[PDB]
Amino acid sequence: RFASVYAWNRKRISNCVADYSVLYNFAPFFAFKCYGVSPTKLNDLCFTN
Amino acid sequence: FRVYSSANNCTFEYVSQPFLKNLREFVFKNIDG
Structure with a gap:
């Protein structure tokens, strides 16, 4: 169950290997728009949170 | 049994x-975080 638009549910992702490749398998994606980065090379970077 | 202090938000x-x-030896230090 998702939260309201004003009470947007926030979660912090730290200390874990990010397989940004299973973000798929969920839908055809009405929108999958990435800003400032590319959808493919997300696996070529590492971040803090 | 596990109450150090209140108001914790880690x-x-x-x-x-x-x-x-x-003899349990140990050591602690910080180096640029």
Whole structure:
């Protein structure tokens, strides 16, 4: 169950290997728009949170 | 049994597998965080 638009549910992702490749398998994606980065090379970077 | 103090809001979590005629030596230091 998702939260309201004003009470947007926030979660912090730290200390874990990010397989940004299973973000798929969920839908055809009405929108999958990435800003400032590319959808493919997300696996070529590492971040803090 | 596990009350150090109140008003704790740590989001980050961390490691496990606890540490422990019985001289237990240890050492602690910080280096640029």
